[PDB]
Design a protein around this ligand. Structure first.
Ligand SMILES: C[As](C)(=O)[O-]
Ligand SMILES: C[As](C)(=O)[O-]
Ligand SMILES: [Zn+2]
Ligand SMILES: [Zn+2]
Ligand SMILES: [Zn+2]
Ligand SMILES: [Zn+2]
Lengths: 363, 363
C-alpha cells in the first residue's frame, strides 16, 4: 500500500512515476577495465573520442576505447536525457549500485534538479571482477551497507538509493557473488518498497540457481525481484517461462544495444526482442515484463549514433504494435509495469527495522 | 586473357585493381519513391537531414526520410571514399545502372579524378517499380542501349560503363523484368569482359529461375554473373550451394547494412553473414564469393554513424579471421575475387561485334 520510490531528491508516489526506464546508467566509469584491442582494426579506436565516425568499430570492440569507458560528463547526460523527457519520460533508474563501477550520487542529484526527471539511485555490489575482496565481507556487514544507503544516504551525503542492485552474478557465479546475493536479500527483507535488480550472465541460464537462493533460501517476495539482461535468453522460451512461473520480473534491458562483444556474446537484435516480448505477452506474462536500454557506454548515446534513451518508448513500443500486441498492454509496459516492480510494497515484509536483524533479541 | 575493367577514366588491368568493392552506390537518387511514415515515430524523420542523431529511427524506417533518399553531394561522397582509400582501397563499382535510380556519370568521373580511385560505372535497367514501360521495349533495343553504354558512352558523354547491372529482378519478377534480363544477357554475350550483376529479391529464392534464363536459355558464362543481395539467404545453405554449383558468383553486398525495412524484411546481422560466408568457404566455395556494403542511403555513411566503405575490408575480414578462416583465402576475398568477377574474360564469348547480333547476315 502507498507505494513509492525513493529518488535522489525525495519520495515519489507510484501513481506519479509516469514513463519510467528501470535499468540505465547515467554515471558510470569502467576506466579500470579497458581491454586491449581485440582485432586488427581495434588499435585505431583505443585513443579516440567516441563519435558517430567510429561506430563502425565500437560495435565490435566497445571495451578497447578509453573514452567509451570513461566518466560521463553531466552536459552529455542531460542532453541525452532531454530526448527521453521530450517523449514524456518522467522517471529513470541509474543501476550503478557500487563505487566499483563509478556510481556518482552527487551528479545524479544534479541531473534530477536540472531536468526535473525523477532519478533513482541504486545500492548493490557488482561482479567479483570489479568488487574483489569486497564480496568476502560478512553478509550482515554487506546487508547493513545496502540498508544504510537506502535509508540514510550514500558516500557521506543524505542522498538515498531507491533500488537494490544491480547485484553482480558473473558467468562464474563465485562464492562471493552468492554471498553478495544473500546480503541483498537480507537488505530487501528489511525495506518494504525496495526492488532488487540482479545482473544476470545473460548468455547463460543461471536463473534457477539464483532464484533458489533468493526465493527458496532467503524467502524474498518474487514480485520485488527482477532478472536483468534477460534479452539474450529470449529464444529460450522454456527457460524464460520457468523463471516467470516462479513469480519474478524478466527485464529486457538491452533493447537497441546493437553491439557485439568479443567474448560474452552478441546482443540480440531489436526485432529478436520484439518477437520474444510479443510471444511472452501472448503466453499471458505481460504483467511481469519490464523494458530498458542499459545505456552504459558513450557509443550508446543518440548524439553518437546510438539509440539513446528514447528508443524503447518511441520505437520498441511501435514495433510491438505492428507485431499485433494490444494497445492496452503496450501502454502498461513502460508505465504500470515498472511502477509496480519499483514501487509496490513487498507482500512478505511490510516493516522497516532500525536494524535488518530487528527480529532477534538485543538483550 | 588480358583482363581489365573499363573505368570512368579508362581501362585498368585486372592485376592493378587492388582492394575492390564490387557493389556500391556513389550517386543515386530515390526521390521519386519516398514512402509515407510507416510507424507512429516515423513522422519526425520525414523532413530532417540525415545525421547520427536520427539513426535510432532511420534504422527502422529509412525510406520515409526525404534527405536520406535524395541526391548525394560530391563533398560527402569524397569524404566517405577517403575512408576506403586510407585502407588501401583502389577500385569501387557504382551499381546505379539506370537514370531511373539517379545514375550520375559526370560526378562518377569527377570523383575518380579527385581521389585517384578507379571508379566503375554500370549500365542496366532496374526493377519495374522504377523503370515502368522502359522494360516493355524491344529486347534488341534494350541490349543495344547497354552495349552502347559499355562501348561508346553514357548520356551523351564519352564516359563508359564497365559492368552490366544491377539488373532488376523484383519480388514479382515481372514479364518486363524477364525481358530486361534477356537484354542484359544479349549485351553481355557481345562484351567479353563485362560482368553482369543481378539485383535479386534477397528475401526470396528466385535464383534457379533467374539462372534458367541467363544460363540455360541465353547461354551466358556463369563465371561472369553475380547474384546481388545473397545475404538474406545466408542461412539457406542448400539454396546457396545450389546456385554456386551452377557456376555463378554469390555476392554478399549488405555487409554492415544494419537496417530493418518495414516490408521487404530485416537485414542479416554482420555476425550472421560472417557465419554464412565462413561456412561456404569451408564447403570449398571461397573462390566464388564477393563482398560489398551496398551503400545507397545517406544513413549508411560513416559520418552519420553508419558503417561507410571501410567496413568490409577492415572489420568483416577481421571477423572472418577470428572465425578461423585462412589468411590466404581472406586476402583473396576483396582482391583476387572481385578482380576475377569484374575483369576476367568471358569463356564463351571472346569477340565484341560492332552489332550484338553481329553473327547474323547483314545482307
Ligand atoms: C554495467 As552492465 C553491462 O552489467 O548493465
Ligand atoms: C539500389 As539497391 C537497395 O537494389 O542495392
Ligand atoms: Zn548488468
Ligand atoms: Zn546495467
Ligand atoms: Zn539491388
Ligand atoms: Zn545496389
Amino acid at each position: 500500500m502507498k507505494g513509492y520510490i525513493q529518488t535522489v531528491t525525495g519520495p515519489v508516489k507510484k501513481a506519479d512515476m509516469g514513463l519510467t526506464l528501470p535499468h540505465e546508467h547515467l554515471f558510470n566509469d569502467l576506466s579500470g577495465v579497458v581491454d586491449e584491442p581485440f582485432y586488427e582494426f581495434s588499435h585505431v579506436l583505443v585513443d579516440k573520442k567516441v563519435s558517430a565516425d567510429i561506430q563502425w568499430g565500437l560495435k565490435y570492440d566497445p571495451y578497447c576505447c578509453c573514452d567509451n569507458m570513461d566518466k560521463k560528463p553531466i552536459e552529455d547526460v542531460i542532453f541525452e536525457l532531454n530526448n527521453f523527457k521530450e517523449l514524456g519520460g518522467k522517471t529513470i533508474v541509474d543501476a550503478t549500485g557500487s563505487s566499483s563501477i563509478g556510481r556518482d550520487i552527487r551528479k545524479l542529484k544534479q541531473v534530477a534538479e536540472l531536468t526535473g526527471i525523477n532519478v533513482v539511485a541504486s545500492s548493490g555490489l557488482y561482479i567479483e571482477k570489479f568488487e574483489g575482496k569486497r564480496l568476502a565481507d560478512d553478509i550482515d556487514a554487506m546487508a547493513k551497507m545496502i540498508d544504510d544507503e537506502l535509508n540514510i544516504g550514500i558516500d557521506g551525503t543524505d542522498i538515498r538509493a531507491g533500488m537494490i542492485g544491480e547485484i553482480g552474478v558473473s558467468p562464474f557465479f563465485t562464492d562471493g557473488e552468492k554471498n553478495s546475493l544473500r546480503a541483498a536479500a537480507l537488505a530487501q527483507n528489511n525495506n518494504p518498497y525496495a526492488s532488487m535488480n540482479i545482473h544476470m550472465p545473460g548468455w547463460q541460464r543461471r536463473g534457477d540457481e539464483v532464484l533458489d537462493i533468493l526465493l527458496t533460501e532467503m524467502g524474498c517476495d518474487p514480485a520485488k525481484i527482477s532478472l536483468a539482461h534477460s534479452d539474450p535468453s529470449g529464444k529460450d522460451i522454456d527457460y524464460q517461462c520457468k523463471m516467470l512461473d516462479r513469480g519474478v520480473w524478466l527485464e529486457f534491458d538491452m533493447i537497441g544495444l546493437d553491439i557485439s562483444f568479443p567474448k560474452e556474446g552478441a546482443a540480440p537484435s531489436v526485432m529478436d526482442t520484439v518477437e520474444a516480448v510479443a510471444t511472452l505477452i501472448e503466453r499471458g506474462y505481460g504483467n511481469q515484463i519490464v523494458l530498458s536500454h542499459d545505456v552504459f557506454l558513450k557509443q550508446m548515446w543518440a548524439k553518437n549514433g546510438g539509440n539513446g534513451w528514447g528508443f524503447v518508448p518511441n520505437v520498441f513500443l511501435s514495433l510491438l504494435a505492428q507485431r499485433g500486441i494490444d494497445k492496452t498492454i503496450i501502454d502498461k509496459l513502460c508505465i504500470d509495469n515498472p511502477a509496480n516492480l519499483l514501487a509496490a510494497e513487498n507482500l512478505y515484509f511490510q516493516s522497516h527495522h532500525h536494524h535488518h536483524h530487528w527480529s532477534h533479541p538485543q538483550f
